[PDB]
Amino acid sequence: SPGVVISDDEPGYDLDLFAIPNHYAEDLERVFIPHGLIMDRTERLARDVMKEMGGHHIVALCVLKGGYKFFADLLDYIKALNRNSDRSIPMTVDFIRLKDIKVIGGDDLSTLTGKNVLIVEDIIDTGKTMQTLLSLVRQYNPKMVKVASLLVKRTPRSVGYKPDFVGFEIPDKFVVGYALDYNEYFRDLNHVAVISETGKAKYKA
Amino acid sequence: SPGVVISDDEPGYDLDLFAIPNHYAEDLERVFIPHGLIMDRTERLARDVMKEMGGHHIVALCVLKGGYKFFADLLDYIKALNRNSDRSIPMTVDFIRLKGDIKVIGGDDLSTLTGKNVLIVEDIIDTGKTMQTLLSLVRQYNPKMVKVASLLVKRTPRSVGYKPDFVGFEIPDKFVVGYALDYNEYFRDLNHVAVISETGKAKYKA
Amino acid sequence: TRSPGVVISDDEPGYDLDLFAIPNHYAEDLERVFIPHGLIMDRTERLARDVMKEMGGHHIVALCVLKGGYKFFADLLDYIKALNRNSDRSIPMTVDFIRLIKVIDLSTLTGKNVLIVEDIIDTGKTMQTLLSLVRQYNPKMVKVASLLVKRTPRSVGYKPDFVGFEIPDKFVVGYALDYNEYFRDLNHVAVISETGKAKYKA
Amino acid sequence: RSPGVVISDDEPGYDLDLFAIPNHYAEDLERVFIPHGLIMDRTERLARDVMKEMGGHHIVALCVLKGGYKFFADLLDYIKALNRNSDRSIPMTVDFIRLKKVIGGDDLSTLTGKNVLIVEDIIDTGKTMQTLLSLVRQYNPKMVKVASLLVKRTPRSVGYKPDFVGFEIPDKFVVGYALDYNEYFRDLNHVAVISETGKAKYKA
Ligand SMILES: Nc1nc2c(ncn2[C@@H]2CN(C(=O)CCP(=O)(O)O)C[C@H]2OC[C@@H](O)P(=O)(O)O)c(=O)[nH]1
Ligand SMILES: Nc1nc2c(ncn2[C@@H]2CN(C(=O)CCP(=O)(O)O)C[C@H]2OC[C@@H](O)P(=O)(O)O)c(=O)[nH]1
Ligand SMILES: Nc1nc2c(ncn2[C@@H]2CN(C(=O)CCP(=O)(O)O)C[C@H]2OC[C@@H](O)P(=O)(O)O)c(=O)[nH]1
Ligand SMILES: Nc1nc2c(ncn2[C@@H]2CN(C(=O)CCP(=O)(O)O)C[C@H]2OC[C@@H](O)P(=O)(O)O)c(=O)[nH]1
Ligand SMILES: [Mg+2]
Ligand SMILES: [Mg+2]
Ligand SMILES: [Mg+2]
Ligand SMILES: [Mg+2]
Ligand SMILES: [Mg+2]
Ligand SMILES: [Mg+2]
Ligand SMILES: [Mg+2]
Ligand SMILES: [Mg+2]
């Protein structure tokens, strides 16, 4: 599936209908994807992940910083599956940051050889970052490598790359929240939201 | 505040995008309000309730059976507020069924409501007749205040005009199930609010 | 041959209240945290699996014994629901409520797998009375889950099928267990102090 | 201040059969030592403690990978919950660092003038935290505090005590809640003690 499709003309929600941290009160335009909805969708994705990847040792690879919340929650749902089912599989974890592009941190990638590798991202936009990471990862001969991304953006700048698991397909809009940032701000927000002009100006680099 | 407005044209969500119990796989047509969204809205309502009612002992009345999930979750969010704040107020609970005065079944003596901040908690307001008549009874026990929280309010021409004090979601005139709301006692064991299909309608019919 | 639950010893000190988040209106009224809320959840998660193992073969009716059972009931059912939607296999579940020995329409029990959900078993006389009434409605099976079972000489020997914790002969409150209707609005199970005992005394 | 929840040397832990446990670790664990839910309850109180002390100014929360990731996520979730249900709050930014040399973080100048919260899974000798602190202090934070889920009672301690502590535990090797043995047991929600067969099976 393309995930939960959020239409171009999605109006989102009035902030007054939700609990919002006060320090971001004027910096947000609308709530775009409620935290709870992210959780419900992530619950189903964890089941899809275990269906496809639960046959062999999984290495879950978090793409920092944006990926950290989705990663923690996805893995928590996966762990819930594994302790309430008959069949389970070991899972190990690693974290990388990407800074053209080179991998920062992480274990020696020879640890990926022969494993079912799940790369976890916050968002796919152009897809160039994932294309680059995949090309690296495949050189270490994983048993399989799959990508799960909370968000996929509809954009004419797309190179054509599509991930294996998708939370939501969104319009070409700049979103923040749930660890997605604007100049490092708004990671401390449980909902995905759209940033206001006031907010854009306030936290401008 | 009419709460979160779900419009008449809202298509809801395809079932294959969520985790759905297999025994209801053919009996639902769409997810209408995802459980997580109910939780986010209920978190906000809990704050609203403490703002207005947190000044004096609250008696929270759960209207069984449909109200039980909203009740449990609303009170959980209120408790979270109360153990992470500087000022706090005791809350007691009671559970009632409803069917001259409206008949209140299974609760404490209504003298328990006297001088208290009474919060009546419902799953849904439709015609509003049930809440109007319950309020006429409860006022006679002289509460310090009485307010109603309802997860759902229907837009319907059959409404007698009653509006609750706290509302989660304002929805169309369609039959919804899940989050303890039932069709012939089924679908209470579903975490999302959903619209029932025509095939599910027949299977669980009288 | 069955789990006796998490056994809490007679000498269990519990936990300093200052280590946890506690509602301020109960700060002077509680002596110790006895069973942390989160531990109740962990045990309840396991109990849900045990329930589906024994009862998941046929339509389950969960019967909540009010008022004290309401929290355990809601949480236990939420864990059962999670089990039912994250697997290809599932079974319908209906719910009912009864308050108690006098009772306050149980045709919803006939031919089904009945799970009675209780907060605590002490003497056992209440459960023996409820069971004899429930069996008159000819259910397919009846089992009882109780969050707590108390070790007491006054026990008539009733043992529930599912037990969260086996506790000493101490009066506990919280997680919907009350003292004169107070302390239901508390997430942890706790022991009541001498101050609270007298403050909310009837 | 407090010493945290004190777990005694003779703490028996819990029978594994009382809890939900991943089957692939069924013979690799001896006991449940700290139930996941108890960690959450303690972490909820720690979040309130942190905000009381650090909530007056922009906080930079530093996660010490890999073991700190679960405690970090949950602590910050409870802090987020406070910030959206209170009248006033403060922004928080985050960074993740691995130690071997600080790897993968932002330039340390980003800490200058900020309230810095370092978040760790466990303090044993305390040498790591003394080292990390000495580095951070070169960049003049407004304040710097350490939160550790676990602090061991050990004569190997150099004497360093963190500002926020979840649990003070015996000198035993524990796993779970992102704490590992040769990278295993991070996918376990409880904190547990490893069995002899588990140590053998996952031996490096
Ligand atoms: N907060 C937000 N961030 C976005 C948005 N669209 C893209 N991005 C990304 C900006 N971004 C980063 O800030 C990377 C560093 P970190 O924040 O530590 O994960 C990478 C962008 O994600 C997509 C690229 O990987 P791609 O074009 O190669 O597919 C957006 O609508 N909101
Ligand atoms: N599942 C569903 N139930 C609905 C719906 N609209 C109304 N109702 C209610 C049906 N109903 C009951 O079944 C009562 C018993 P319980 O199920 O144990 O709470 C009461 C109706 O709620 C509105 C009335 O109180 P009111 O018209 O006086 O305002 C609906 O769209 N779905
Ligand atoms: N808060 C607490 N309540 C307790 C305690 N021991 C017993 N009890 C029970 C007191 N109680 C009630 O108040 C019933 C009404 P409700 O509060 O609305 O569910 C029933 C007692 O539970 C056991 C009996 O059913 P049993 O002796 O027949 O097995 C205790 O240590 N704390
Ligand atoms: N799983 C476990 N790990 C432990 C335990 N005691 C110490 N440790 C630590 C082992 N360890 C690591 O493996 C670092 C890498 P990572 O696992 O990715 O965070 C660091 C040790 O923590 C304390 C040191 O910082 P310190 O002596 O300087 O205070 C333990 O009882 N169980
Ligand atoms: Mg990213
Ligand atoms: Mg970014
Ligand atoms: Mg109702
Ligand atoms: Mg109904
Ligand atoms: Mg009882
Ligand atoms: Mg009682
Ligand atoms: Mg560490
Ligand atoms: Mg380690």
Short mmCIF file of N, CA, C and O in Angstrom, two decimals, chain A residues 106-185:
data_model
loop_
_atom_site.label_atom_id
_atom_site.label_comp_id
_atom_site.label_asym_id
_atom_site.label_seq_id
_atom_site.Cartn_x
_atom_site.Cartn_y
_atom_site.Cartn_z
N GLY A 106 27.49 4.19 14.14
CA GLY A 106 27.06 2.84 13.79
C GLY A 106 28.12 1.79 14.05
O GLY A 106 29.31 2.10 14.18
N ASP A 107 27.68 0.53 14.15
CA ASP A 107 28.60 -0.59 14.23
C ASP A 107 29.30 -0.77 12.88
O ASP A 107 28.87 -0.19 11.89
N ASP A 108 30.36 -1.56 12.87
CA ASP A 108 30.92 -2.02 11.61
C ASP A 108 29.80 -2.72 10.86
O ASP A 108 29.11 -3.57 11.42
N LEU A 109 29.61 -2.34 9.60
CA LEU A 109 28.47 -2.83 8.84
C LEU A 109 28.61 -4.30 8.44
O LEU A 109 27.68 -4.87 7.87
N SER A 110 29.75 -4.91 8.75
CA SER A 110 29.88 -6.35 8.57
C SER A 110 28.92 -7.07 9.52
O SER A 110 28.63 -8.25 9.34
N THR A 111 28.41 -6.36 10.53
CA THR A 111 27.38 -6.91 11.41
C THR A 111 26.05 -7.10 10.70
O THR A 111 25.16 -7.75 11.23
N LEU A 112 25.90 -6.53 9.50
CA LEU A 112 24.66 -6.67 8.75
C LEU A 112 24.64 -7.94 7.89
O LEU A 112 23.58 -8.37 7.45
N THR A 113 25.81 -8.54 7.67
CA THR A 113 25.92 -9.69 6.78
C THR A 113 25.08 -10.87 7.25
O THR A 113 25.16 -11.28 8.42
N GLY A 114 24.26 -11.41 6.35
CA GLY A 114 23.38 -12.53 6.66
C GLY A 114 22.15 -12.21 7.51
O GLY A 114 21.42 -13.12 7.89
N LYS A 115 21.90 -10.94 7.80
CA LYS A 115 20.77 -10.58 8.65
C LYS A 115 19.63 -9.94 7.87
O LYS A 115 19.82 -9.45 6.75
N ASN A 116 18.43 -9.94 8.45
CA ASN A 116 17.33 -9.19 7.88
C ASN A 116 17.39 -7.76 8.39
O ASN A 116 17.03 -7.49 9.54
N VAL A 117 17.82 -6.84 7.53
CA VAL A 117 18.08 -5.47 7.94
C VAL A 117 16.87 -4.58 7.71
O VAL A 117 16.38 -4.48 6.58
N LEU A 118 16.39 -3.94 8.77
CA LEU A 118 15.28 -2.99 8.65
C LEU A 118 15.79 -1.58 8.90
O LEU A 118 16.19 -1.27 10.03
N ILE A 119 15.83 -0.76 7.85
CA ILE A 119 16.22 0.63 8.00
C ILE A 119 14.98 1.45 8.34
O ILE A 119 13.94 1.30 7.69
N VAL A 120 15.06 2.29 9.36
CA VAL A 120 13.89 3.04 9.82
C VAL A 120 14.11 4.55 9.65
O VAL A 120 15.06 5.12 10.21
N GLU A 121 13.24 5.20 8.88
CA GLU A 121 13.35 6.63 8.61
C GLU A 121 12.12 7.40 9.05
O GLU A 121 11.04 6.82 9.19
N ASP A 122 12.29 8.71 9.26
CA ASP A 122 11.15 9.60 9.48
C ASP A 122 10.43 9.95 8.18
O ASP A 122 9.20 9.92 8.11
N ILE A 123 11.19 10.27 7.13
CA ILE A 123 10.55 10.72 5.89
C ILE A 123 11.41 10.47 4.66
O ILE A 123 12.65 10.56 4.70
N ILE A 124 10.73 10.10 3.58
CA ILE A 124 11.31 10.01 2.25
C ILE A 124 10.79 11.21 1.47
O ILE A 124 9.58 11.42 1.38
N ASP A 125 11.70 12.00 0.92
CA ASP A 125 11.33 13.14 0.09
C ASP A 125 11.80 12.90 -1.35
O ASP A 125 11.04 12.38 -2.18
N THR A 126 13.04 13.27 -1.65
CA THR A 126 13.60 12.99 -2.98
C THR A 126 13.92 11.51 -3.12
O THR A 126 13.91 10.97 -4.24
N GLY A 127 14.22 10.86 -2.01
CA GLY A 127 14.65 9.48 -2.03
C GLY A 127 16.14 9.26 -2.24
O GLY A 127 16.62 8.13 -2.20
N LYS A 128 16.89 10.34 -2.44
CA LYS A 128 18.32 10.20 -2.71
C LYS A 128 19.10 9.64 -1.51
O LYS A 128 20.01 8.83 -1.69
N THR A 129 18.74 10.07 -0.30
CA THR A 129 19.38 9.58 0.92
C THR A 129 19.23 8.06 1.07
O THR A 129 20.20 7.37 1.40
N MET A 130 18.04 7.54 0.84
CA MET A 130 17.81 6.10 0.96
C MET A 130 18.53 5.32 -0.14
O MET A 130 19.09 4.25 0.11
N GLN A 131 18.50 5.84 -1.37
CA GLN A 131 19.19 5.20 -2.50
C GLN A 131 20.67 5.04 -2.16
O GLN A 131 21.29 4.01 -2.42
N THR A 132 21.22 6.09 -1.57
CA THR A 132 22.62 6.10 -1.17
C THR A 132 22.89 5.09 -0.05
O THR A 132 23.83 4.29 -0.15
N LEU A 133 22.07 5.09 1.00
CA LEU A 133 22.27 4.17 2.12
C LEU A 133 22.13 2.71 1.70
O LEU A 133 22.96 1.88 2.05
N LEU A 134 21.08 2.40 0.94
CA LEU A 134 20.88 1.05 0.40
C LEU A 134 22.09 0.53 -0.38
O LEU A 134 22.49 -0.61 -0.18
N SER A 135 22.65 1.35 -1.27
CA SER A 135 23.81 0.94 -2.07
C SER A 135 24.98 0.54 -1.18
O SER A 135 25.73 -0.39 -1.50
N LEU A 136 25.16 1.26 -0.08
CA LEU A 136 26.21 0.91 0.89
C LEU A 136 25.89 -0.42 1.56
O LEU A 136 26.69 -1.37 1.48
N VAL A 137 24.72 -0.48 2.21
CA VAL A 137 24.26 -1.66 2.95
C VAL A 137 24.34 -2.96 2.12
O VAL A 137 24.87 -3.96 2.61
N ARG A 138 23.87 -2.94 0.87
CA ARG A 138 23.90 -4.15 0.05
C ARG A 138 25.29 -4.74 -0.18
O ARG A 138 25.44 -5.93 -0.49
N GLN A 139 26.32 -3.92 -0.04
CA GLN A 139 27.67 -4.42 -0.23
C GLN A 139 28.12 -5.35 0.90
O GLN A 139 29.13 -6.05 0.77
N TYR A 140 27.38 -5.36 2.00
CA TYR A 140 27.72 -6.23 3.11
C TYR A 140 26.88 -7.51 3.10
O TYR A 140 26.89 -8.29 4.06
N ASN A 141 26.19 -7.74 1.99
CA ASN A 141 25.37 -8.94 1.80
C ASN A 141 24.41 -9.26 2.96
O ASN A 141 24.55 -10.30 3.59
N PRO A 142 23.45 -8.36 3.24
CA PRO A 142 22.42 -8.75 4.21
C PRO A 142 21.55 -9.85 3.63
O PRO A 142 21.54 -10.02 2.41
N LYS A 143 20.85 -10.61 4.46
CA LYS A 143 19.93 -11.62 3.96
C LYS A 143 18.81 -10.91 3.19
O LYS A 143 18.39 -11.37 2.13
N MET A 144 18.36 -9.80 3.75
CA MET A 144 17.42 -8.90 3.08
C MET A 144 17.61 -7.50 3.64
O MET A 144 18.11 -7.34 4.75
N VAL A 145 17.22 -6.49 2.88
CA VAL A 145 17.18 -5.17 3.46
C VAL A 145 15.90 -4.47 3.02
O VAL A 145 15.56 -4.47 1.83
N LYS A 146 15.19 -3.91 3.99
CA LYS A 146 13.91 -3.25 3.77
C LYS A 146 13.93 -1.90 4.45
O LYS A 146 14.68 -1.70 5.41
N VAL A 147 13.12 -0.98 3.96
CA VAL A 147 13.03 0.34 4.56
C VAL A 147 11.62 0.63 5.04
O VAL A 147 10.66 0.42 4.31
N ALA A 148 11.50 1.12 6.27
CA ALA A 148 10.22 1.57 6.80
C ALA A 148 10.34 3.06 7.05
O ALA A 148 11.29 3.51 7.71
N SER A 149 9.41 3.83 6.48
CA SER A 149 9.44 5.27 6.66
C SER A 149 8.09 5.72 7.17
O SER A 149 7.03 5.36 6.61
N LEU A 150 8.10 6.50 8.25
CA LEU A 150 6.84 7.05 8.75
C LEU A 150 6.08 7.79 7.65
O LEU A 150 4.88 7.56 7.45
N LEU A 151 6.79 8.67 6.96
CA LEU A 151 6.18 9.56 5.98
C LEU A 151 6.81 9.43 4.60
O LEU A 151 8.02 9.29 4.48
N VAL A 152 5.98 9.48 3.57
CA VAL A 152 6.47 9.63 2.20
C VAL A 152 5.83 10.85 1.55
O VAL A 152 4.60 10.95 1.51
N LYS A 153 6.65 11.76 1.05
CA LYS A 153 6.15 13.00 0.48
C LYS A 153 5.86 12.86 -1.02
O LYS A 153 6.68 12.32 -1.76
N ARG A 154 4.69 13.34 -1.46
CA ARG A 154 4.40 13.45 -2.89
C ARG A 154 5.11 14.67 -3.44
O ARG A 154 4.78 15.80 -3.08
N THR A 155 6.09 14.44 -4.31
CA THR A 155 6.90 15.54 -4.80
C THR A 155 7.41 15.28 -6.22
O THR A 155 7.75 14.14 -6.55
N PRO A 156 7.47 16.33 -7.04
CA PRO A 156 8.03 16.20 -8.39
C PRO A 156 9.55 16.00 -8.35
O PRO A 156 10.16 15.71 -9.37
N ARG A 157 10.13 16.14 -7.16
CA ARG A 157 11.57 16.00 -7.00
C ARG A 157 11.95 14.56 -6.70
O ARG A 157 13.12 14.26 -6.50
N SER A 158 10.96 13.68 -6.65
CA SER A 158 11.22 12.28 -6.37
C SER A 158 12.02 11.61 -7.48
O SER A 158 11.74 11.81 -8.67
N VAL A 159 13.02 10.83 -7.09
CA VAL A 159 13.84 10.08 -8.02
C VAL A 159 13.18 8.75 -8.38
O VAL A 159 13.70 7.99 -9.20
N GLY A 160 12.04 8.47 -7.76
CA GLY A 160 11.31 7.24 -8.02
C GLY A 160 11.42 6.19 -6.93
O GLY A 160 10.78 5.15 -7.01
N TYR A 161 12.23 6.45 -5.90
CA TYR A 161 12.38 5.48 -4.81
C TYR A 161 11.17 5.43 -3.87
O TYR A 161 10.71 6.46 -3.38
N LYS A 162 10.70 4.21 -3.60
CA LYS A 162 9.60 3.98 -2.68
C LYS A 162 9.99 2.94 -1.62
O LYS A 162 10.52 1.88 -1.95
N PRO A 163 9.71 3.24 -0.34
CA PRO A 163 10.10 2.30 0.72
C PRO A 163 9.17 1.10 0.80
O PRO A 163 8.14 1.10 0.12
N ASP A 164 9.54 0.11 1.60
CA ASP A 164 8.81 -1.15 1.69
C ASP A 164 7.64 -1.05 2.65
O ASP A 164 6.64 -1.75 2.50
N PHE A 165 7.78 -0.19 3.64
CA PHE A 165 6.73 0.05 4.61
C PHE A 165 6.53 1.55 4.74
O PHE A 165 7.51 2.29 4.89
N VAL A 166 5.28 2.00 4.68
CA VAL A 166 4.97 3.42 4.71
C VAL A 166 3.85 3.73 5.71
O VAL A 166 2.77 3.14 5.64
N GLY A 167 4.11 4.67 6.61
CA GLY A 167 3.07 5.10 7.53
C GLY A 167 2.03 5.92 6.79
O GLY A 167 0.88 5.50 6.64
N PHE A 168 2.45 7.10 6.31
CA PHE A 168 1.54 8.08 5.69
C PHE A 168 2.15 8.66 4.43
O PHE A 168 3.35 8.93 4.38
N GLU A 169 1.32 8.86 3.41
CA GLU A 169 1.75 9.57 2.22
C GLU A 169 1.22 11.00 2.28
O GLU A 169 0.00 11.21 2.33
N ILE A 170 2.11 11.98 2.28
CA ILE A 170 1.68 13.34 2.56
C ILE A 170 1.92 14.26 1.37
O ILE A 170 2.67 13.90 0.45
N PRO A 171 1.24 15.44 1.34
CA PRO A 171 1.48 16.47 0.32
C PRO A 171 2.87 17.07 0.43
O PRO A 171 3.58 16.87 1.41
N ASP A 172 3.24 17.85 -0.58
CA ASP A 172 4.51 18.56 -0.58
C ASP A 172 4.44 19.79 0.33
O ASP A 172 4.34 20.93 -0.14
N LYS A 173 4.47 19.52 1.63
CA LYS A 173 4.37 20.50 2.72
C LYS A 173 5.46 20.25 3.76
O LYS A 173 5.84 19.10 4.00
N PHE A 174 5.95 21.30 4.41
CA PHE A 174 6.98 21.08 5.43
C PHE A 174 6.34 20.78 6.79
O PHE A 174 5.69 21.63 7.40
N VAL A 175 6.55 19.57 7.27
CA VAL A 175 5.95 19.16 8.53
C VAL A 175 7.01 19.03 9.62
O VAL A 175 8.19 18.86 9.32
N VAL A 176 6.59 19.14 10.87
CA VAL A 176 7.48 19.00 12.03
C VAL A 176 6.75 18.18 13.09
O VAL A 176 5.56 17.91 12.97
N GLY A 177 7.47 17.77 14.14
CA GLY A 177 6.86 17.04 15.22
C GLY A 177 7.19 15.57 15.11
O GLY A 177 7.59 15.08 14.02
N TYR A 178 6.99 14.85 16.21
CA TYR A 178 7.31 13.42 16.29
C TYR A 178 8.75 13.17 15.79
O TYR A 178 8.98 12.30 14.95
N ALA A 179 9.66 13.98 16.32
CA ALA A 179 11.11 13.97 16.07
C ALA A 179 11.52 14.61 14.73
O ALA A 179 12.71 14.76 14.47
N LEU A 180 10.55 14.99 13.89
CA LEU A 180 10.89 15.79 12.70
C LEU A 180 11.09 17.25 13.08
O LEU A 180 10.29 17.84 13.78
N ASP A 181 12.19 17.84 12.60
CA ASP A 181 12.60 19.14 13.12
C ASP A 181 12.63 20.25 12.08
O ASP A 181 12.74 20.01 10.88
N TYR A 182 12.64 21.47 12.60
CA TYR A 182 13.01 22.65 11.83
C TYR A 182 14.15 23.29 12.61
O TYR A 182 13.92 23.78 13.71
N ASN A 183 15.36 23.25 12.05
CA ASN A 183 16.55 23.74 12.73
C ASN A 183 16.66 23.24 14.17
O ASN A 183 16.95 24.01 15.09
N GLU A 184 16.40 21.94 14.33
CA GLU A 184 16.52 21.19 15.60
C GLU A 184 15.34 21.35 16.55
O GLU A 184 15.21 20.56 17.50
N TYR A 185 14.48 22.33 16.29
CA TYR A 185 13.28 22.54 17.09
C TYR A 185 12.13 21.66 16.62
O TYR A 185 12.16 21.15 15.50
#
